[PDB]
């Protein structure tokens, strides 16, 4: 019958998002996916470094924060394995040796200065006790802009699942998607390329088999909610926690049962356009996570995105230890960081060998 | 096969919100559906009284802005036609005359003291040109709680839908429907009775036709998201524009046009346990205002809810002009003030007469 | 940016359902809304006559099937108490005594002639053991069509919905929506007013919580795809279970208890414009199935819809073993029946009593 | 709070579909799926044949129709180069020149017997004029079945999609998705590898871009509904139109282009597990159908599927021609069959030469 003239936007297969920075992000997704690197993860909140720093006797404050990020950061040769870091929002606004912003310092050595979004986890109020959501979608233009003029291109945004009794709500899986999608999209108009973190977590005593069904789930709706919002395929990562047997299940699985497991669910989930998978590591110990990668990164599964890592605790580790939060710690404490990104980028490439940890 | 215990909260059919102010939000409701009342709107933002208060060389100040509310809040009498009244932010912890703040002063005329927690309208960057979504959920519960704490009882949050070329984006109509209806459980967590606001404009060239079908199927995703939340029905209110004729459209429709229209809109959508619909007036004059909402309570479609209004200039213009902005504008500001309260509590009764007026 | 011309018809808010039986459609709404009426619902399959007509040894024939039926529909004075009949398959076919078909029969007596369109049960093969899809979508239009040329002017259409423990797979719920939805609408396009019967059976253990519950989810969904397919509101009617204590569960609810947990079920989950709910009495007695309307009419919850019955045995067995096969039956049997629709008649006018059973 | 012990089968992570079948049907994609092989789509409904006739003046009878297909199911040596044939519901019944029924004159052969499994397009009655749904589901599992007692082993189903102005309506996108998922899950629980074919047609004078953004659109819900129904990606395939311009759209696409914005499209929206794309090559005329694949089989961008051919006319049409429907024409008829065949078979292993045709 009638005709009507509308805005091509106004049509629902008309809804992919239109920014200006489409090609720079496709370009920061480039260097973000180079094979043989990973993401060092340097997000940690301030709080967290109370507990952090105790082991090693270093007070929990701004300029030993500094230092403990210029441990990594000022690492040379660390450019080799890392082609970019997720930052802290304090990290941003800090100065490496040199009198550069850890922005301007790691962007001067080649690495991608990456921040991190989001806002933190809260109560999620619908569901189940113990579930979760994240906030900081409010105000996040503004916010990701002041970062992008810092010379941040990439950010990063976390939120979890936990199984309880085998399962996860509805509540929690719709939601945490809906937040994702939103938060990938406002990166995105941003200039900032996002990766979507939707954590199934490691706790509990469930089995690889559950945790495979709900990692299954909760990914496939982070995929609808994120078509639905119309996002940048070209132009985002994903980083979820790989397929494995709960904390406190009692078992470990071996690294080609974890690959097989893990590939299979990304597959089952994302669309092929996806242009990467850097991994969490939460709750692995530093060598599992690098055996656990590099399985991954020789399974016979279909994985056309770049599957590489995004860890924290994992390359951490060892370093901070041999640091012990000393100037004269330095030396030993890179070797350590050097050593486990290099496990890692030989991970990434399919070529990691045990016998060199 | 296999059994699997689990929490009844993790079953899809066990989602209904749980919250210990169930029965107080359900009273608050009976006090906001009282037969001859309604809600006043107080809630413009600060900027607007700048506009608001230039016809009348009233200097947009703090003071001057309490000495506006209190115009009409400190009008003895009202109760007998406002049952509760939408608070800006700043005038909740304003004092009435007698030191009281205002939400102790409203109380103690048995007024409910209301509250609107939305944060403003952003570019929604989905979607068509001109779209946009609502934000302030971030932290919603900590703000709602102390509003709480200083006797708010009902809060209001209001999205907008923008009626171009005959249509809305559907990604407005989900991702503004999901907002509300997060809204309102959170607010219902809080132990706010949350007044759902979802406004399609009047502004435009389109059609009661337009607006009627446009209303549908905005206000019918409303209610699916707000069923996805799990909301308390018994405890919540809506507020939504009338559907009536585009702004520009050129023609003015007849209050039982107006009546059939509206009535057939919400009854197609709303459940019947929907306790009330207080009515936005957005573009009407102040005299339509109470034509339409008369018409609208002689309907003879069906209608379970209380239709009443929630109205801020159709109860405020004549009052404001009268006032000046004087102290000695007060009595006369107040007369049409109570006039139009009552115009409206008769048109609430379905007894309006435009002889009245 | 660009514009592009469209169909109206294109555009997600212009999806209403567009028929030219429309207004026919409403007058038998109309009709089959009168107050004190209600409907019979004759349309038992072949097969279960087998077992029903044991108790009588009344052999299973097509006349002794066509005897059965006229036991009801000849009975002088039905018309006072049934606005409309759904007859079986079969049965549009037959000829009351005068010769005329039982269409053509009933309709002449101003009673409206029904029909029931699904094609039954069947494994849903999706959710859990024992749930079960409905069939008979394919070539529906031209079925209805050539019913709606015999003089049918409505139709009736039966999902089931199983709980077991507690709850019902989200496959059944949305899938036997979707059928629901997509039923009513192809009914309408061929000018019978679709009833739409999402039964919750009462079988098991469950209590009336639990069926409370199943029942608010699964008739959220129904609603759900109602509006997704466009349906004429204004033209079609539901066809419910009571919300009661399962048959095995032990118990057995006061009719208050029913009613009030029945329309609140429905208030919370029907758009207020459902014209009518047309209760079905499976697992009921015969006496409660009129206790239980009379209740439900007289509850003081919302309830904009008519509210009456859609019963088979519950206006049919004492009829069937007064009548006990024979001529010689006739009189007796259609005492009974009469009885019955008339306790009915009264139950829906909320003025039942149960001094008259 | 509360636990309740159910089936897994209730939960939603648990919905995968569970069929004894599971294993035979990745064998089936396995052979399916052979390097340099592609299916022969030979599903021409009877009436088609009068048309598809004319011009070989042959005229359109059952055993017309069996020698039609028997100039392709035994044209010696196809199996090099065919993995597999769709077969209309006729030639599943009709036999060889051996006495074989064709199922099992192509098992013995090695190639896998398919059946178009779908009745049919008809009106969607929801959505814009010409939008239009497809028939079958009712009764599929005893059709399916049968088929499979036949010798089938993998069906296809074809839904269309209608560019119309620049868009497609969102009735159309979400049913016809549904019908597909549905009809997946049928098809495995019946021991058939079904070939999910959701086609936007080349029909209208849209672009290449508008066709990209269609099929995007319309792909991604495809999956969507496909996840819902939880079927089995390992043993599925998807049978696509490639992204080109519209037929009358003035313009032609260069392979290279054409590549790019199919592999792109089905990147975006195909989950990574899917094992195999097999194109449809509507309105293509057979070279073009060749160096689009072709130049499919060298795209850049990601694919992790087999992607190949499931021609009809693309393969035939030279065939029928010499052919000319006599016993004399078999011998050159065969060699343009075997040629065509050849060159797709060459241009699945992206080795295709237009110099070779």
Same mark, same amino acid.
């Given at each position: ?14 809804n ?5 920075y489409?090609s720079e ?6 260097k973000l996916?180079t094979?043989? &690197?990973?993401?060092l ?29 210029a441990?990594?950061?000022?690492? =040379? !040769?660390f450019?080799?394995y ?7 929002d304090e990290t941003?606004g800090?100065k490496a040796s040199?009198?550069?912003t850890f ?6 050595r /080649?690495?991608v200065?990456g921040?991190?979004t989001?806002?933190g986890?809260?109560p999620?109020?619908? +569901?189940?006790?113990?579930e979760?959501?994240t906030?900081?979608?409010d ?6 802009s002041?970062?992008?003029?810092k ?6 945004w976390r939120n979890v ?8 709500? =509805?509540?929690?899986?719709r ?5 994702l999608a ?5 990166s995105?108009?941003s200039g900032?390329?996002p990766?979507?973190?939707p954590?199934?977590?490691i706790?509990g005593?469930?089995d690889?088999?559950?945790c495979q ?5 909760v ?5 609808a909610?994120?078509?639905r919002?119309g996002?940048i395929? =070209? /132009?985002?990562?994903? &980083?979820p926690?790989?397929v494995?047997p709960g904390?406190?299940? +009692? &078992?470990?699985?071996?690294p =080609? ?5 893990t590939?299979?669910?990304?597959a089952?989930?994302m ?10 590591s939460? +709750?692995?110990?530093?060598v ?17 995105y770049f599957?590489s890592?995004?860890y924290?605790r994992a ?7 041999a640091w !012990?939060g000393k ?6 404490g890179r070797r350590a960081?050097?050593?486990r ?10 070529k990691?060998?045990r016998?060199?940890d």
């Amino acid at each position: 019958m009638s005709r009507v003239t509308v805005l091509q936007s106004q049509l629902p297969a008309y809804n992919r998002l239109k920014t200006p920075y489409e090609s720079e992000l496709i370009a920061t997704v480039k260097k973000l996916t180079t094979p043989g &690197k990973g993401l060092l993860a340097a997000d940690e909140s301030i709080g967290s470094c109370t507990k952090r720093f105790q082991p090693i006797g270093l007070s929990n404050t701004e300029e030993h924060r500094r230092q403990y990020r210029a441990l990594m950061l000022e690492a =040379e !040769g660390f450019e080799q394995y890392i082609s970019g870091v997720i930052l802290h929002d304090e990290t941003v606004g800090q100065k490496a040796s040199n009198g550069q912003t850890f922005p301007e310092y790691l962007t001067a050595r /080649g690495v991608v200065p990456g921040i991190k979004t989001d806002m933190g986890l809260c109560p999620l109020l619908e +569901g189940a006790e113990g579930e979760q959501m994240t906030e900081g979608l409010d105000g996040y233009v503004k916010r990701a802009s002041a970062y992008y003029k810092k010379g941040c291109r990439f950010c990063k945004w976390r939120n979890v699942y936990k199984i309880q009794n085998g399962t996860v709500s =509805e509540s929690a899986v719709r939601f945490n998607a809906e937040t994702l999608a939103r938060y990938a999209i406002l990166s995105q108009m941003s200039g900032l390329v996002p990766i979507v973190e939707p954590e199934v977590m490691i706790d509990g005593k469930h089995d690889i088999d559950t945790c495979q069904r709900v990692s299954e789930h909760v990914w496939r709706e982070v995929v609808a909610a994120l078509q639905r919002h119309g996002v940048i395929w =070209e /132009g985002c990562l994903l &980083k979820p926690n790989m397929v494995v047997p709960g904390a406190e299940s +009692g &078992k470990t699985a071996a690294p =080609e049962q974890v690959a097989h497991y893990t590939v299979m669910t990304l597959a089952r989930t994302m669309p092929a356009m996806l242009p990467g998978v850097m991994f969490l590591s939460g +709750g692995l110990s530093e060598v599992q996570a690098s055996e656990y990668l590099n399985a991954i990164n020789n399974s016979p599964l279909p994985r056309p995105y770049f599957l590489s890592f995004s860890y924290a605790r994992a390359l951490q580790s060892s370093a901070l230890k041999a640091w !012990g939060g000393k100037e004269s710690g330095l030396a030993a404490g890179r070797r350590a960081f050097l050593h486990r990104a290099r496990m890692n980028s030989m991970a990434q490439l399919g070529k990691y060998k045990r016998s060199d940890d």
